[PDB]
Each structure stands twice: as structure tokens, then as C-alpha cells.
Design an enzyme around this catalytic site. Structure first.
Site, mmCIF file in Angstrom:
data_model
loop_
_atom_site.group_PDB
_atom_site.id
_atom_site.type_symbol
_atom_site.label_atom_id
_atom_site.label_comp_id
_atom_site.label_asym_id
_atom_site.label_seq_id
_atom_site.Cartn_x
_atom_site.Cartn_y
_atom_site.Cartn_z
ATOM 1 N N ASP A 148 -14.683 30.759 -8.775
ATOM 2 C CA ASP A 148 -15.482 31.005 -9.820
ATOM 3 C C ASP A 148 -16.673 31.849 -10.271
ATOM 4 O OD1 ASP A 148 -13.757 28.736 -10.444
ATOM 5 O OD2 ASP A 148 -15.069 27.107 -10.235
ATOM 6 N N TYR A 173 -13.507 19.872 4.137
ATOM 7 C CA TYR A 173 -12.843 21.221 4.509
ATOM 8 C C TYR A 173 -13.677 22.281 4.654
ATOM 9 C CZ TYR A 173 -13.256 24.847 1.000
ATOM 10 O OH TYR A 173 -13.583 25.829 0.141
ATOM 11 N N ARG A 174 -14.968 22.197 4.466
ATOM 12 C CA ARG A 174 -15.967 23.638 4.668
ATOM 13 C C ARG A 174 -17.199 22.998 4.547
ATOM 14 N NH1 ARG A 174 -17.262 29.564 1.789
ATOM 15 N NH2 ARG A 174 -15.585 29.051 -0.032
ATOM 16 N N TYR A 231 -23.645 26.752 1.036
ATOM 17 C CA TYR A 231 -23.147 26.937 2.440
ATOM 18 C C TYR A 231 -24.104 27.685 3.240
ATOM 19 C CZ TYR A 231 -18.474 25.073 0.876
ATOM 20 O OH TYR A 231 -17.607 24.423 0.138
ATOM 21 N N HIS A 279 -27.689 25.147 -5.601
ATOM 22 C CA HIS A 279 -26.712 24.394 -5.208
ATOM 23 C C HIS A 279 -26.179 24.327 -3.635
ATOM 24 C CE1 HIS A 279 -24.365 27.736 -4.688
ATOM 25 N NE2 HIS A 279 -23.435 27.488 -5.374
HETATM 26 C C1 FAD Z 1 -22.972 28.807 -5.784
HETATM 27 C C2 FAD Z 1 -21.423 29.111 -5.993
HETATM 28 C C3 FAD Z 1 -20.473 29.279 -4.998
HETATM 29 C C4 FAD Z 1 -19.170 28.936 -5.287
HETATM 30 C C5 FAD Z 1 -18.816 28.507 -6.405
HETATM 31 C C6 FAD Z 1 -19.484 28.786 -7.452
HETATM 32 C C7 FAD Z 1 -20.845 28.891 -7.480
HETATM 33 C C8 FAD Z 1 -21.710 29.089 -8.656
HETATM 34 N N1 FAD Z 1 -17.311 28.690 -6.385
HETATM 35 C C9 FAD Z 1 -16.484 28.762 -5.572
HETATM 36 C C10 FAD Z 1 -14.926 28.667 -5.694
HETATM 37 O O1 FAD Z 1 -14.410 29.081 -6.863
HETATM 38 N N2 FAD Z 1 -13.908 28.857 -4.492
HETATM 39 C C11 FAD Z 1 -14.708 28.951 -3.317
HETATM 40 O O2 FAD Z 1 -14.044 29.049 -2.516
HETATM 41 N N3 FAD Z 1 -16.179 29.237 -3.089
HETATM 42 C C12 FAD Z 1 -16.862 29.134 -4.101
HETATM 43 N N4 FAD Z 1 -18.430 29.034 -3.989
HETATM 44 C C13 FAD Z 1 -18.870 29.491 -2.790
HETATM 45 C C14 FAD Z 1 -19.144 31.053 -2.689
HETATM 46 O O3 FAD Z 1 -19.670 31.503 -3.632
HETATM 47 C C15 FAD Z 1 -17.823 31.705 -2.274
HETATM 48 O O4 FAD Z 1 -17.291 30.871 -1.299
HETATM 49 C C16 FAD Z 1 -18.137 33.149 -1.756
HETATM 50 O O5 FAD Z 1 -16.900 33.758 -1.865
HETATM 51 C C17 FAD Z 1 -18.650 33.155 -0.435
HETATM 52 O O6 FAD Z 1 -19.631 34.257 -0.245
HETATM 53 P P1 FAD Z 1 -19.153 35.694 0.613
HETATM 54 O O7 FAD Z 1 -17.837 36.132 0.188
HETATM 55 O O8 FAD Z 1 -20.319 36.725 0.446
HETATM 56 O O9 FAD Z 1 -19.123 35.111 2.371
HETATM 57 P P2 FAD Z 1 -20.250 35.827 3.369
HETATM 58 O O10 FAD Z 1 -21.563 35.420 2.534
HETATM 59 O O11 FAD Z 1 -20.255 37.262 3.441
HETATM 60 O O12 FAD Z 1 -19.991 34.756 4.437
HETATM 61 C C18 FAD Z 1 -19.276 33.823 4.650
HETATM 62 C C19 FAD Z 1 -18.838 33.363 5.982
HETATM 63 O O13 FAD Z 1 -17.881 34.056 6.339
HETATM 64 C C20 FAD Z 1 -17.752 34.579 7.788
HETATM 65 N N5 FAD Z 1 -17.387 36.011 7.594
HETATM 66 C C21 FAD Z 1 -17.802 36.697 6.638
HETATM 67 N N6 FAD Z 1 -17.516 38.176 7.184
HETATM 68 C C22 FAD Z 1 -17.111 38.155 8.361
HETATM 69 C C23 FAD Z 1 -16.583 39.389 9.310
HETATM 70 N N7 FAD Z 1 -16.432 40.223 8.647
HETATM 71 N N8 FAD Z 1 -16.272 38.816 10.496
HETATM 72 C C24 FAD Z 1 -16.324 37.388 11.080
HETATM 73 N N9 FAD Z 1 -16.713 36.534 10.221
HETATM 74 C C25 FAD Z 1 -17.119 36.781 8.926
HETATM 75 C C26 FAD Z 1 -19.177 34.286 8.153
HETATM 76 O O14 FAD Z 1 -19.164 33.056 9.243
HETATM 77 C C27 FAD Z 1 -20.049 33.489 7.008
HETATM 78 O O15 FAD Z 1 -20.495 32.340 7.795
#
Ligand code: FAD
Ligand code: FAD
Ligand code: EUG
Ligand code: EUG
EC number: 1.1.3.38
Lengths: 550, 550
Positions: free
Chosen positions: B160, B493-494, B98, B412
Site C-alpha cells: 500500500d 500472522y505478524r 509494528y 497506526h
Molecule cells: C502504516 C502503513 C504500513 C503498511 C501499510 C500501510 C500503512 C500506511 N500497508 C502494508 C501493506 O500493504 N502490506 C504490508 O506487508 N505491510 C504494510 N504496511 C507495514 C509497513 O509499511 C510495511 O510492512 C513496510 O514494508 C515495512 O517497513 P520496512 O520495509 O522499512 O521494514 P524495516 O523497517 O526495515 O524492518 C522490518 C523488520 O524486518 C527485519 N529486517 C529488515 N532488514 C533486515 C536485515 N537485512 N537483516 C535481518 N533482518 C532484517 C527486522 O526484524 C525488522 O523488524
């Protein structure tokens, strides 16, 4: 129709008459009543608040219009902009003790979405949901179910009475009593008429249904919904549906509500709690029974003077003028075979499973001496349990309407703070409400509705609407409880028109960062402050806080 | 530092160089890095897209900034508003497939919220919730639960892997697999730095904690929450919480997530479906079990290759270069004692309850030929079941990271259409996804995950990042996938940085009313559009669409 009883702000008499003319033109003079009377629950008033705590002609409309369809609501709105005429959208206007169909701003155009916009638009058996227009009551829908043999595949979820709008209620974030008890939470796919006039549907409702020949050239209002509109709420990007409940962001015209499939087995029950202080250990028992899904629905914890009022008015228990003593309430308990607190619940699903929840729950409530367990059959025939058996399977009654008549000229008013699902904390809130109720000379009458982690405390203020002294004593009661409970970290979840401003003024973290942020978005979507100014404390730029706030 | 590879739009070197100097004086040098490398999952990069389909330096920061506190975040918002500086807040930036940390608009200041804002502020055993800052990985919280013995009381809900921010995932509306798998719907009470830089706390979090000595004089950030802050989502008034998921409306500093209590019994299970076509009957069977509550969590239906690729890359199965054929998939299946589809779920609660559900389920899946049931113990040391048996009990793991290495340079991307819980619909989508992977000469890897009334279907596109022809091929696939699925009534959805504007244009009902409404709100609240202009396709009025979309 010429000279009205109250005009909206800044508007000349000349302008009222040109306004109504085009409305009469658009809707036909059937669907317009200008106000130049109190009624009942059955033919609901659309002019004023029937259970009034203020003056009777305080919160009062100027007209009432009944849009026949969705494009009537666009026309009327586009018009209200042109003049700058406040509107007040109602569905069925049975929001009683919350003010009914009274406008917060005297002089408004109460908008009767319900009188004609009426259709049960869809029931989807494999999706297990339904789409409703504002005019569909709980009864309407129920009578749609039974006429189609759906009663044996999907159950509804209903408040204490069946008059209410399915959507009007859901938008108000209200509460029923099955596993599907959290009404707002059960929504998917909303249609909203915006302040600007533009039509909107949210969630996957914004994902257009693929084009087909049979649907060509159909007005947006009348188009079908894409397959997932009502199965996933979120859709894509920001999830705005909630901006539209307990708000003045729009006028809701359609709404998807999820329906629970027939579980395959049902039994209701009543556990009776002998003493007043049995609240504390009760709640302490419910706590990890709720959190661990041994209690599947939304159970209630009724006070004795609640059932007592349903089965007969005050006068038929005591000729006393002050509120009834603690010993006098004890008598009424052994009288009616009830306790001081009554806990009404229900089990759902196959016999193997009900069996075990019941053995757990019974077994949990055994550490309270004097307790007693009842299935419906075991009670008097007038019984509340015998009515509530119906409420916890989605069959709407009217029986409970009676408790309103605990005092001469029946009128209620709600205070609904929120307390922890702790016995300790529940006691605290009861002691704080009880105290201020005697000072005001009322009785305390109430229920706790048990949500997973929260508890809705409904303080049922009945007063007789033709005692000019007591209606002021209620007015003082109301303003003190909000304050007292705030002082203690509880706030109300919903209120009457006269108390919106205070209760919102209750949530003032970091200098009302919530309201200031709301006021922002209101002024952005409704540049002209025409959709229901005032609702939930939220005032647009052209309604001065000083002139308007209560 | 003086010279970044990319400047945010309309911004001078001299301005940039003040902002930076200014930024550095707040948060110390150690916490600020201009950019003038793809990293790992074990130590995620914060400048650009690690699994990048577009050019390696297409989505690029000009600097990273780690505030040591909410006051910093505030100070920064302040500067960015002066200079008109794009921010792009991440918690943990592990959002791979993503776009990881990468900023929609290059030249942005990635705000690394996690590096210093870290703490688990709270685990409340009565409340069966917890309170988390942007930096609290799942795993981190997990180990916290352990060092305070809570493991036998409150369980987690992991997706996951274990790297994920408890909250970063939540405001993406992410999904895990205990019965509290709807992460976003488990929030109550969030904190937020608005674009203007004013601090907001939502829901009951707006009703403040009553004054007592021990909290006098604390900065708003460091003030405690009032009692019902994390037990009742709603507060009073218009429910704005949703406004902050998959939107660019605020920077989130804290959040309250519900934690599920040790359910007193647990069993997981593998059900293998032997045919490609079994998916169809299989889902129909799920439909009633889901909706009648026989299925307690988010069971998922995995395509076989998923398990294949966890177990060892493409090479380890054939030196074939084109997607492996149907027959090799029948081969691989049997090789690993698996089916063509794979159903994973769990049973929670006492022995007597488990028993009954698990028979209702065995029995219902028996109507599918050659079906086979495995518990954890019944499978080989390395099994996916043994892994998920952990996942399904809130234990974080990482083995699943392997599937990414199907090809020489693992990366991915995800495509995430929602789908009906009806076999016929499910097969439709499968067909359509598959045909398209086939045409891009790629191996189809997916799951559906079972929602109550919908299914999240994660097409798992994986390609090798040094292959430009494949990169380009993947950019034709997704864009075709979004279009076809829209044309058959399915939204995603995302999504990923480079498909946000497109997916939104897919939710275009009634001449795009949804976005237009959302563009309105976003300007009101962020006149100078400094917060993440672009997210979810939502653009400030200073970002011309022509210049910016894709
Ligand atoms: C490659 C992968 C990913 C994955 C997965 C399995 C594999 C191996 N399985 C998932 C699953 O079981 N369910 C799911 O929902 N997602 C899954 N993924 C995708 C990914 O690994 C996860 O979604 C992971 O939790 C996301 O990474 P993270 O938690 O680090 O999110 P981020 O990188 O920090 O940023 C994400 C977005 O969120 C908004 N954001 C984040 N923090 C803020 C703050 N505090 N304020 C305002 N907005 C915020 C941002 O817009 C950003 O785009
Ligand atoms: C006195 C009484 C009330 C009551 C109850 C028992 C008694 C004896 N038991 C209830 C219950 O258990 N659960 C519950 O949620 N409410 C209970 N009530 C309170 C109330 O009477 C009913 O809930 C009733 O269903 C609500 O009134 P109604 O359904 O008829 O809706 P309304 O009058 O139109 O009020 C809605 C308010 O919200 C805004 N609104 C409503 N509809 C719209 C639409 N269409 N579009 C935009 N805004 C809308 C209005 O501003 C109005 O104030
Ligand atoms: C008496 C019933 C009742 C009245 C008003 C409410 O808001 C409510 O919701 C929990 C219940
Ligand atoms: C396969 C796992 C997965 C990956 C990304 C997501 O967003 C997701 O949510 C349903 C699941």
C-alpha cells in the site's frame, strides 16, 4: 531375533538383542523383521536398494520395524537414543533409483512408517486440501477419492507412478504435473516427531484447536487441527517447515497437502519436435509462455528413448551392444510417430480459455518446420500420451514402470541437475550429459520438467544390475556428471544415497558455509545423531567425516 | 561519543565507550550517532517507535550504525560478540504500526543497513527477477526500472505505500497485490551475515559461480551468483530460507526477488457492496473464484472508513468524539458513492482472457443486492480506485498515508489475524474485532486481503499518540484482541514490538513445542545472543524470560 547380517556402529551383539526385545515387546513380533532379497515394485523391499549401483549388501538395514501408531514412534526413538541406534525413516520405500528403503548407514533400523500408519485422515472440500499419513499412496488416496464421489470436486497431483507416498514424496521436495505440480510448495501443517522425542506440528498447526468436550484427554497425536492449520503455511515467527525436507531433522507423521478443485474442463496435448537440435528453439518458446501463465501446469520435454523404452525394451529395437547411433534414433521416431523431443502439456479450465492458450501455443510452435499437434484420441492405443493424459489430471498409472526394462536386469539411477529456462543453456547441459554417457557406453534417456524459471533435468541411467563391469562404469558416470555440471554452474536437486556427499560437497560457496551451518543445527536438535545420519551429506559430530563420507 | 540514555544489559559505560570508539574507527563518524524525535515517513527515525503505544522512549536505541559494506556488518558482528552487544538490524525502519525502527530490547545498536547499502545489483530480463540490497525502497527500484526502460517488460509488486524496503518487507512475509503479491514466496537466493559473523548464501546461491578471470580475488560479498541462484528457491538439502523470516537468525545483506513481466493487458475494478452484512455472502462468492483462479491477484475487501480516512480525517465527517455510528457509516458510504464494504481487484493479460474472467466475476457478485461496478475512469479525481489502479500495476504511491491522520495525532498499529475464506468465519471475526473496538471507544478500520485459501485481516487501530488514556486503551484492545481470536482458533500472522511474546504464547500447541524448538536452534547459532534477542518472542538463554517478556 539373534545374529544379524550387519550391526550399527559401536554396538555390541548383546545390546542389539536387548534393543530388539523391547521393540518386539512394544510393536509385537508382527511388526519387527531382523535381517539374518530383491523383490519388485509391487511388494517393495525394506531391507536394501533394489536398483543398486554399489554392492547389493552395501546399503543394508539390520532390522525393520513397523510402528502401528505415533506413540510407537516416540517409544522407538526414545529407545534408539538410549542405545544410540541409527534409524532410517521410510514411508513406502519406493524411492527407487534414489536408493529405495536402503539406509545410508549399514546397520540401521529402517522404520516402516507406512505398513500400518495408513489413514487418509481428512479431505476438506471447501478448504480444497487433504491430510495424509505416510502409508497413503497416490493410488490409496485416489481410491479414497472415487469411493466418496470427490473425483468430481477435487483433483490430485501425481508423479509418473502411483506407488509413491503422498508425503514421503512431498518431503523429498518432488514433482508432479498439474498446476499443483510443485509438491513441497503445496504443503501446509506438518506433524513431526523430533529427534528428542517431542511431538511437533508447524505453521498454524502450532495454533492449538480451541478446547471442546468431544476432544478432551485425547493424545496429542490424535488431537484435531485448528481451522487454519492447512490453509496458511507460515503461521508466526520463523517458518521451519522446510528444515524438514531433504533433511534429517525429524520423522514426519502427518502432512497437509492442498488439492486443486475440478477446473471445469480438461484437454491434454503433444507437440512433436522433428530434429535433435529442436530442443533449443523449443525451450526458447516455452520460456515466456511459462512465465506468462499460458502454460498452466508443469509440462515435460521427453527424449525419444524414454517413450521407446515404455512401449518396449531395448532388444526389440536393435541387437546392438554399444549405445544407439543418431540415425538409429531417427528411425525409432518415424517408427512410433514421435519426434526427437516430445513436449507433453495440458490445458485447464473453461472452454473459452483453453481455446486461447491453445491458439497461442500452437501458433508459437509454428516457427519450427515439421512440427505436429496431437490430442490423445489421435494416437496409437499403447501410447504414452494416452497414459500421460491420466497423469495430468491426477489419475495414477503404472505403465511407465516399463522403461526400467530397457536393459536385461532392470535398474535405474537418477541425475537431476538444474538448468535455466533458456534454449541455449538447455542444449549445453544435454551436450555435457550426452558426451559422458557414450564414454560410459550407455544410452541417454531423459525429460525436462518445466518450472516457472527453472528446469529439472532428469538423466535416466538404466543399467543391468548383474553386469559387474557396467555398474562400475555407471559409478564413474555418476561422479563425473556431478563434477562436470558444477564446473558449469548446475547442481543436482536430489540424489541416490551413494552420491549425497558429493552433490552436497558441490554446493561449497565460501568454504561450505551451507553445510557448516547445517551441521550446527543438526547437532543442536539431535545431540545423539540417531535420526538418519548421512542424509544429504549432513553428518553429526559422532560420525567422523573420514570413516563415513563417500 | 560518551553517554547514551540507555545501556544494553550487563554493559558498562567504559565498555560501551570502547565499542563505540572501535565502531567509529571502522565506519567514520558521519555513520555513527549515540543518543543522549518522532521524525516522518518522508524521513523515518531510527531510535524508537514513531507510532508508539507504549511510552515514547520505551523501545530505544543507544546508538544508530550505518555500515558502508558487508565487511562492516561483519566487523561489527565481531565487536558485538566480543562485548555481548545487542544488535537490531533494520533496512529502512519504515515498519510503522509494528514499531518502525525501534529495537525489541532498548540499548541495542540499531544497524541502519539501508543508509549506505543501497544498490539495485541486478534486473535480469530473461530471469524475470531482480537482486536487491537492504536499502532499495520499492520506489527506488521503480525509478531504476524506468531509467533503464524496463517498464514495458518487468512490473513490480508494491504494498500500500512506496517507502518500504523491497527486502525488509519480504523477510517480514509482507504482502502486495499483483499476482506476485506473496513477497516472501517470490524470493530465491538470499545472502546473510550469521550471528558468528560467517557469510552465507542460500538455495542455489550455495552453488558458486564458476571461476573465470574477471571475478578472481573479489571478497565473498562482491562475488557474483551462479546461474540458477535466483530461479530455483531450493538448492539441495534442507531448505533453510524460511529460518530467516520473522526470526532473529541472521542479518540479511542481499536477496533475489522475482519480477512479473508486463502481462500484455491490465484492468482494475471496484465492486461496491451496499450492506454491513454483505461481507458474508461476498466472501463465499470469493472462495470459488479465488481457488478456481478466476481472481488473479490479492484482491482486497476494505471496510468503508478506510476509504473515508484516505479522503479526509475524522473531523471532516463529524466533530463527534466517540466512534461514528452505523448510520453515519451508511451516510458516509453514499456520500462518497461507495459501499459498506469495498472490493478491489484486477484483470491481467490479453483482452480475450480479461473479458471471460470479468464476466465470470460480474455475474457471480450480481447475486448480492444493490451491487455496483466501477472502472477507474468511472470515479472522481481523488478516488481510492484511481490510487489502487496504480498500486495494482507495481507503481508505488503514497496517498494512502492519509488514513493515518484520522485523529489529531495520527499513528497506526496493526492487528493481523488470518481468517478462513468462508463468510461465516469472516463475520465471526468481524463481530469480535468490532465489538472490541467499540468497547475501547474506537473507530473500526480494517481490510481483509484475499489469500489463496486464507485471508489476512488487518484491523487498522489508529489512536492519537499524545493521548495517554487512549494509548493505554489501545494496549488493552490488542491484548484482548489477541486472546479472543486465539480462543476461537485464529492466530495473528505478524505483530508489533510490544505483542510479540504474547502472540507466540498463542501458538502454544503440545506444551509450546514450537518455541522450545526455536529457542534450541537459536542458541546453537548465536551462543552470546547479540542478534535481535526478542523478535517474534524468541529469546536467547542469557535473556531470562521473567526479566524480558510482556
Ligand atoms: C502504516 C502503513 C504500513 C503498511 C501499510 C500501510 C500503512 C500506511 N500497508 C502494508 C501493506 O500493504 N502490506 C504490508 O506487508 N505491510 C504494510 N504496511 C507495514 C509497513 O509499511 C510495511 O510492512 C513496510 O514494508 C515495512 O517497513 P520496512 O520495509 O522499512 O521494514 P524495516 O523497517 O526495515 O524492518 C522490518 C523488520 O524486518 C527485519 N529486517 C529488515 N532488514 C533486515 C536485515 N537485512 N537483516 C535481518 N533482518 C532484517 C527486522 O526484524 C525488522 O523488524
Ligand atoms: C524409478 C522411478 C522413480 C520415479 C519416477 C519414475 C520411475 C520409473 N517418477 C517420479 C516422478 O515423476 N516424480 C517424483 O517425484 N519421483 C519420481 N520417481 C522417484 C520415486 O520413486 C518416487 O518419487 C516415490 O514417490 C518416492 O518414494 P516414496 O514415496 O515411496 O518415499 P520413500 O521411499 O519413503 O523415500 C523418502 C526419503 O526421504 C526420507 N523420508 C521419506 N519419508 C519420510 C518420513 N516419513 N519421515 C522422515 N523422513 C522421510 C527418507 O530418508 C527417504 O530417503
Ligand atoms: C522420471 C521422473 C522423475 C524422476 C525423479 C525426479 O526427481 C523427478 O522430478 C522432476 C521426476
Ligand atoms: C492495510 C494494509 C496492510 C498493513 C499491514 C500489513 O501487514 C498488511 O498485510 C496484509 C496490509
Amino acid at each position: 531375533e539373534f545374529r544379524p547380517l550387519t550391526l550399527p556402529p559401536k554396538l555390541s551383539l548383546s545390546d542389539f538383542n536387548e534393543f530388539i526385545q523391547d521393540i518386539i515387546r512394544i510393536v509385537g513380533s508382527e511388526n519387527v523383521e531382523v535381517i539374518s532379497v530383491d523383490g519388485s515394485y509391487m511388494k517393495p523391499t525394506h531391507t536394501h536398494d533394489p536398483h543398486h549401483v554399489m554392492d547389493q549388501d552395501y546399503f543394508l538395514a539390520s532390522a525393520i520395524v513397523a510402528p502401528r501408531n505415533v506413540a510407537d514412534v516416540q517409544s522407538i526413538v526414545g529407545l534408539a537414543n538410549k542405545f544410540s541406534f541409527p534409524l532410517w525413516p521410510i514411508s513406502i520405500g519406493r524411492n527407487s533409483g534414489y536408493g529405495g528403503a536402503a539406509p545410508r548407514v549399514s546397520g540401521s533400523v529402517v522404520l516402516d512408517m507406512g505398513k500400518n500408519m495408513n489413514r487418509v485422515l481428512e479431505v476438506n472440500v471447501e478448504g480444497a486440501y487433504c491430510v495424509v499419513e505416510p502409508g497413503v499412496t497416490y493410488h490409496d488416496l485416489h481410491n479414497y477419492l472415487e469411493a466418496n464421489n470427490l473425483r468430481d470436486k477435487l483433483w490430485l497431483d501425481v508423479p509418473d507412478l502411483g506407488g509413491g507416498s503422498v508425503l514421503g514424496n512431498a518431503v523429498e521436495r518432488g514433482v508432479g504435473y498439474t498446476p499443483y505440480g510443485d509438491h513441497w510448495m503445496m504443503h501446509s501443517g506438518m506433524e513431526v516427531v523430533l529427534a528428542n522425542g517431542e511431538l511437533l506440528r508447524t505453521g498454524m498447526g502450532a495454533l492449538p484447536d480451541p478446547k471442546r468436550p468431544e476432544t478432551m484427554g485425547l493424545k496429542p497425536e490424535d488431537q484435531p487441527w485448528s481451522k487454519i492449520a492447512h490453509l496458511f503455511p507460515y503461521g508466526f515467527g520463523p517458518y521451519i517447515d522446510g528444515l524438514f525436507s531433504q533433511s534429517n531433522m525429524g520423522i514426519v507423521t502427518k502432512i497437509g497437502i492442498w488439492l486443486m478443485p475440478n477446473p471445469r474442463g480438461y484437454q491434454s496435448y503433444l507437440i512433436t519436435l522433428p530434429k535433435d537440435g529442436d530442443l533449443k528453439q523449443a525451450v526458447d518458446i516455452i520460456r515466456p509462455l511459462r512465465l506468462g501463465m499460458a502454460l498452466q501446469n508443469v509440462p515435460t520435454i521427453r527424449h525419444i528413448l524414454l517413450d521407446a523404452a515404455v512401449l518396449g525394451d531395448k532388444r526389440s529395437y536393435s541387437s546392438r551392444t554399444e549405445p544407439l547411433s543418431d540415425e538409429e534414433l531417427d528411425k525409432i521416431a518415424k517408427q512410433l510417430n514421435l519426434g526427437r523431443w516430445n513436449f507433453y502439456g495440458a490445458l485447464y479450465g473453461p472452454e473459452p480459455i483453453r481455446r486461447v492458450l491453445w491458439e497461442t501455443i500452437k501458433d508459437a510452435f509454428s516457427a519450427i518446420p515439421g512440427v505436429k499437434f496431437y490430442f490423445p484420441e489421435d494416437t496409437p492405443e499403447n501410447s504414452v500420451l494416452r497414459v500421460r493424459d491420466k497423469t495430468m489430471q491426477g489419475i495414477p498409472t503404472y505403465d511407465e514402470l516399463k522403461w526400467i526394462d530397457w536393459l536385461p536386469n532392470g535398474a535405474h539411477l537418477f541425475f537431476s541437475p538444474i538448468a535455466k529456462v533458456s534454449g541455449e543453456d538447455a542444449m549445453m547441459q544435454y551436450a555435457v550429459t550426452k558426451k559422458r554417457c557414450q564414454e560410459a557406453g550407455l544410452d541417454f534417456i531423459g525429460t525436462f520438467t518445466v518450472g516457472m524459471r527453472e528446469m529439472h533435468h532428469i538423466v535416466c541411467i538404466v543399467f543391468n544390475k548383474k553386469d559387474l563391469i557396467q555398474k562400475r562404469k555407471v559409478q564413474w558416470l555418476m561422479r563425473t556428471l556431478i563434477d562436470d555440471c558444477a564446473a558449469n554452474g548446475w547442481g543436482g536437486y536430489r540424489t541416490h544415497l551413494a552420491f549425497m556427499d558429493q552433490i552436497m560437497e558441490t554446493y561449497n560457496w565460501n568454504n561450505s558455509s551451507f553445510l557448516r551451518f547445517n551441521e550446527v543445527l543438526k547437532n543442536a536438535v539431535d545431540p545423539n545423531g540417531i535420526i538418519a545420519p548421512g542424509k544429504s551429506g549432513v553428518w553429526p559430530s559422532q560420525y567422523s567425516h573420514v570413516t563415513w563420507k563417500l
